Ligand SMILES: O=C1N=C(NCc2cccs2)S/C1=C/c1ccc2ncccc2c1
């Protein structure tokens with residue numbers, strides 16, 4: 001707890017800069033939020049098959065979102081962009097990332113090794129080699145330090161909810177990672193213990209329950225409708241005892257806020 | 258700008274990855290350093306070390322961190338273009354072998370290195386390969402952290418990261434004993450070793466293997482127990498058979514150093530990662546009260 005304060009400041013400054021264009025999907029001629037949702041859901045599966053860190057997945061989505069802010073992509077090439085972005089995310093964050101051959105294998109022979117490699121170059125060129133982006137995950141782990149005391153169920157649920165935000169560009173593309181993490185942390189904290197956004201996190205972030213409310217309203221809805229959603233990989237993932245089976249828990253009927 | 262505008266002058270050396278060349282811009286006259294990475298040989302695309310170095314060096318913007326001017330991006334090779342300074346510190350210590358580096362310049366350098374590292378840590382960046390070879394000096398008394406190939410953007414709090422980390426001689430005890438987590442403290446440890454090296458004119462702990470490295474540390478700083486390092490005896494790579502050595506006098510380890518200098522050094526080489534001085538707090542230390550910026554002499 002010597003650099004923790006100015007790291008948080010720096011990350012709060014960076015999330016504004018590594019932010020994707022709010023309504024980029026409207027300007028995309030051939031792809032929609034639905035397709036994006038399929039893409040991200042598939043990336044969740046990849047992360048499960050290769051036991052990848054949550055951070056890697058959150059980075060991949062940021063990379064994809066920024067790439068699509070400046071480049072038009074046809075639907076049949078959207079999976080290539082996701083693959084290259086997952087590959088870059090892995091090289092950046094993972095101790096042992098999967099090799100390129102393994103990334104070719106999970107596309108069911110739709111793309112060649114050559115294509116995935118050229119796309120890697122193109123993503124890097126477009127993102128201009130800036131890959132150290134702030135994520136929901138990074139803000140969450142910081143918030144977890146303020147638990148009185150440390151609770152394993154709440155940690156896993158906050159991760160599950162923060163993850164759900166990645167699937168749906170509408171609305172979550174309009175919120176900063178620190179806001180989403182805040183809303184997620186409070187929602188997980190209320191669900192398991194009944195406790196609320198802690199006093200110490202008000203001092204740290206400058207966020208109140210009132211300032212978090214918009215995002216917290218959407219996130220409650222996504223949580224309640226989670227078994228309905230066309231995409232289910234996240235729910236399947238958080239069934240596991242690794243995450244204490246938090247997806248199977250009953251969400252609260254209302255926040256009362 | 259394309260490689261056509263660059264004339265290679267000399268091959269300088271091998272990095273943690275790639276090959277460093279001195280080169281000259283044919284249009285502007287500007288002397289640069291180039292880091293050449295071949296994307297052939299290893300058909301895994303752009304390597305992670307390059308990916309991490311480029312993205313972290315583009316964020317980091319400090320007078321004591323090497324400046325990255327450009328990234329040239331073929332499908333054949335990848336070049337990084339840096340400002341050309343004079344010389345790496347290892348080469349400078351070789352050039353100053355006969356006379357040694359004056360204490361005021363050692364003070365100046367350590368001060369600037371701590372400033373660069375502090376800026377690094379405040380931006381969630383671990384260097385993880387601080388050593389003379391990876392530090393660059395110029396002709397007017399500046400020094401800069403270079404080679405971020407083995408660097409990592411870390412999280413608060415940290416996960417388990419790569420265990421290979423840091424050139425053996427400069428490797429912290431927590432890595433050697435195989436702790437689950439390590440952090441900014443490992444960069445501090447390396448600086449301490451560099452600091453002593455500049456003063457004593459030889460490496461502080463020149464071990465040959467992991468186990469020999471530990472024993473050289475244990476002999477100088479005393480074997481760690483529960484009082485000095487809470488929980489050391491339970492660490493994965495600790496052995497009951499370790500020789501229980503006593504800490505030796507620090508004015509014997511580093512003779513030319515004043516009381517202020519010994520104080521800082523003993524805090525930079527504290528066993529407990531938690532109790533080890535930060536780069537931020539080390540800048541406050543009385544040792545740096547009368548710090549100046551001398552030029553380096555290199556020809557005698
Ligand atoms: O000097 C650099 N060193 C790097 N890693 C290890 C090496 C040290 C010396 C040769 S290889 S990367 C790097 C870049 C760089 C930047 C500016 C320079 N200015 C003068 C001389 C060498 C330089 C190297």
Ligand SMILES: [Mg+2]
Pocket residue numbers: 025026027028029030031032
């Ligand atoms: Mg559209």
